[PDB]
Design a protein around this ligand. Sequence first.
Ligand code: FNR
Ligand code: FNR
Ligand code: 8CM
Ligand code: 8CM
Lengths: 360, 360
Amino acid sequence: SALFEPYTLKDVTLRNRIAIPPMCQYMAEDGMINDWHHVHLAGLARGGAGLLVVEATAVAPEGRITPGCAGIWSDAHAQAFVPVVQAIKAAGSVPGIQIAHAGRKASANRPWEGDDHIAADDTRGWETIAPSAIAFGAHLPKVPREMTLDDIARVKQDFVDAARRARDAGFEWIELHFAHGFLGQSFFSEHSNKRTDAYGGSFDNRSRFLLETLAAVREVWPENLPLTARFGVLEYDGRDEQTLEESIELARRFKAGGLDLLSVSVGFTIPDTNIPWGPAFMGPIAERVRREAKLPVTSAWGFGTPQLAEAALQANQLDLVSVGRAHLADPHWAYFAAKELGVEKASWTLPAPYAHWLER
Amino acid sequence: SALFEPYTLKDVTLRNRIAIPPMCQYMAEDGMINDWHHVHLAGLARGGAGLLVVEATAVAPEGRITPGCAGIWSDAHAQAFVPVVQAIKAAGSVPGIQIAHAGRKASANRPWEGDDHIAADDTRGWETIAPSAIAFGAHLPKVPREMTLDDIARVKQDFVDAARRARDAGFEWIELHFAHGFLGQSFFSEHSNKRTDAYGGSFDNRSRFLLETLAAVREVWPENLPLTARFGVLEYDGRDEQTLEESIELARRFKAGGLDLLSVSVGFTIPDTNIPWGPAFMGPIAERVRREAKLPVTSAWGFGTPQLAEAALQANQLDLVSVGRAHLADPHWAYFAAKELGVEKASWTLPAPYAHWLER
Ligand SMILES: Cc1cc2c(cc1C)N(C[C@H](O)[C@H](O)[C@H](O)COP(=O)(O)O)c1[nH]c(=O)[nH]c(=O)c1N2
Ligand SMILES: Cc1cc2c(cc1C)N(C[C@H](O)[C@H](O)[C@H](O)COP(=O)(O)O)c1[nH]c(=O)[nH]c(=O)c1N2
Ligand SMILES: O=c1ccc2cccc(O)c2o1
Ligand SMILES: O=c1ccc2cccc(O)c2o1
């Protein structure tokens, strides 16, 4: 089975092609993770996936999505990850982390607590920052503060510090969160970036924050560990071919700047879009990016059907298949997939105290 | 759905009728549990089951099954359980523990490391104890040492100390392991107990170790927390009706001695048997014990098919359904069962960081 073939990138070898993508848990306190995250992540690692990427982890307090978001903006925050990293490694999975800044979509309620921008008089909320003072709209009506050049310098340095901390905590894989309408994506998109300085107003200028952040992170992140990013390559906003062309050009510049793999997503930059949700709907666009930028890719959305994951790999649409919600439903999805694809000794996807008893 | 109806026993309320029975992990070191057990148990608790019973935990070092078995024979061993108990409670499950002594089946290899008695010159092995110096046979050929009266007194006190420690660690449910051919079962069975003192040679004498241990434990175990036992009620050895009659009589004496619920199993006392394995095969015998001893019961083996669990409850064969291997396969089996039975808001079997996203 293609799904169960190992994958090597730089000095890291994944035991199969199943990746667990970053999935916010909304369970941290002042950015500090706790036993929610420890058990959640260690349990997923034991389920058999080759790569486990920790949820969007804020590089700065105002870059959290919500008051429950994880952070890595101090050394104390980083040290909270150390036992979790060690547990993921003990289980034979590769520990990764997505480092992030929510930009204009920050200061929001948890998804089951309204999912909307926090009220002005709520003691939990904060001022958001972005390339331009323009609200997302809809359920995120807060107008962000326009960043100064010093703010740009500071946020870049926060990404550097976050990457340094991730490295020293023992992560073996890093993902820069340049997708989903958050800070990086919003610098790239003309919808959200109306700047007329060096950071807006041409393709090179809109790309600049992302490319400078990548290059700065590359200085502290080991060359032998995968350096990756998540990026929304289209919006489904009626400007798809032009946007895809620009995104693919940026992907080529990421590759040239040392990016090892791209997690291909949708922008979610603005609310007025028409995204054609469906099982594996991103497959063809991930394949196009892979081919035209000549870069390994992953993608997600509806790949939790084992045969569909297998088909995407065999078609060379993807190098790794990211499976999110199916792992919330069943932490041992990789074992389910091994059985469903007829892999020999499928139960040994799991550790011995489980595998021995499940051999059928 | 019957499966998702709460259950109250003494002061404890279970959120549903799904019990996770004790399942040895073989991952402890010198009896001390570790992060294997922490993550395993906390993950299961979050999966939605109403009751989680920790694996057979030895009351004394020689009462382990294997060198990987958990123990509770010192206060340091007990304190290792405290964070796990707290994690199980945080998840809304009830923490229980099975306290045990393997008797003549002790000093064995892990199941994936031979499953047989440890060789005489292996530094990990030890002398086994039992009511009589008679080997199980087959893969367990070691002849145990015949217990003295002082050994009987000592082992009873070890059960008392284990129960006291379980109480003080915060467990809310205890199960005495009087099944599966281990020490207690072997005192009851004429196959293994050939004693001619007060502890063998009539029904009352063979029952004596079990009843005295129950009564001694009852002195330290809170009256407001369920006091339970697992007991093999037949062997499938060609003596089933006589054995069932005696076992039911003993169950009546357990009830009279304060037992709140009986986990009904098979003896496994000797190897030469013909057990009719099949899905829910224990249902009718559990029902007979329940009716004839007028005592709540659980049982296991093949109840991991949701409709079958539901049928057993609706037929009043069982009060709780124990589901073991299906939870090794999928820690979130309770969520799978809720979906499969059409329970309203099935995803909310799981905590919010999962449930919100799985609402269909
Ligand atoms: C609970 C939860 C939380 C998050 C997500 C999703 C879900 C369900 N997703 C998106 C996720 O990585 C994935 O792309 C989608 O869930 C689609 O994949 P599935 O269809 O779920 O396999 C996500 N994406 C991201 O880049 N960073 C994150 O931290 C989050 N947080
Ligand atoms: C890995 C493992 C380990 C154990 C068990 C089983 C398995 C699979 N079983 C028996 C278990 O509680 C249950 O009765 C059987 O597994 C049958 O139920 P299922 O068919 O698996 O749902 C078990 N029983 C017991 O009384 N104490 C224990 O510690 C163990 N250990
Ligand atoms: O990047 C993110 C962060 C949180 C999140 C939550 C749900 C769906 C998503 O796609 C998400 O994406
Ligand atoms: O009581 C026990 C202890 C370990 C064990 C293992 C497998 C099957 C069983 O029934 C078991 O029973």
